Amino acid sequence: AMTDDDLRAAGVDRRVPEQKLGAAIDEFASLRLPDRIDGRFVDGRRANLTVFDDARVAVRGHARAQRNLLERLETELLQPDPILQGLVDVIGQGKSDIDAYATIVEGLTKYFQSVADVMSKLQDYISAKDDKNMKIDGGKIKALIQQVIDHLPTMQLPKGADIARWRKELGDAVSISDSGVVTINPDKLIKMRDSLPPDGTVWDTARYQAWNTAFSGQKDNIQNDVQTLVEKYSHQNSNFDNLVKVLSGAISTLTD
């Protein structure tokens, strides 16, 4: 019964938030540090942050659209009918996942967006000196990265949520407390920060390439974290699409 376009019609299209997130990933990946490319010191790329904003509001909108549909389904479906209780519990579980995921993706997208910001701001603190050396104001950048660390966003799971389950679900890139407060590991940010040098430093093509490779590696590690999160997020959207399809079949079967 419940078909794909049936969900789309109800205003539920996972592809929207999924594409927007992949667009924010493509943007981030497109950012780089200045470097010598084909006999020319080419400055890095400046990020379009609005892309990340688009992804957050789209994730929020999908979440709202999902609960709406879930609520209509639950209300239409309602000693003793074991099927009724079962589905009712499933719905409760679905509702919590919807929120839990929207919150997490939202927070990581803000953190992701904040990194894109420093990846573009630091372009003004790194230039070329001669032709085989670069100048880098490490201090200025360092402070740029610390600002992100200092203002990392904090996320709260839905009341009565299996913390143990989310710890293993979310992975190492994040951290959860017994209160359900999830925080973002600053591991990559710290490494990237402690790689910089004193303001006014000047390294040769080899010294700069060495660091920029190290640095770039940490940034790519940040993008894998979000890619893994996004992939898990999508699997959630599938599960939702599924629960909703079986809920509809149940209503049909049960009516009458």
Q: What is the resolution of this structure in A?
A: 2.6
| String of DSSP letters for the chain | ---HHHHHHTT--THHHHHHHHHHHHHHHH----EE-SSSEE--PPP-THHHHHHHHHHHHHHHHHHHHHHHHHHHT----HHHHHHHHHHHHHHHHHHHHHHHHHHHHHHHHHHHHHHHHGGGGEEESSSSEEEE-HHHHHHHHHHHHHT---EEPPSS--HHHHHHHH-TTEEE-TT-EEEE--HHHHHHHTT---TTEEEEHHHHHHHHHHHHHHHHHHHHHHHHHHHHHHHHHHHHHHHHHHHHHHHHHH--
Method used to determine the 3D structure: X-ray
Domain 1-256, CATH number (from 3.40.50.300, 3.40.1280.10, 1.20.1710.10, 3.60.21.10): 1.20.1710.10
Task: Specify the pairing of strand 133-136 against strand 155-156.
Answer: unpaired
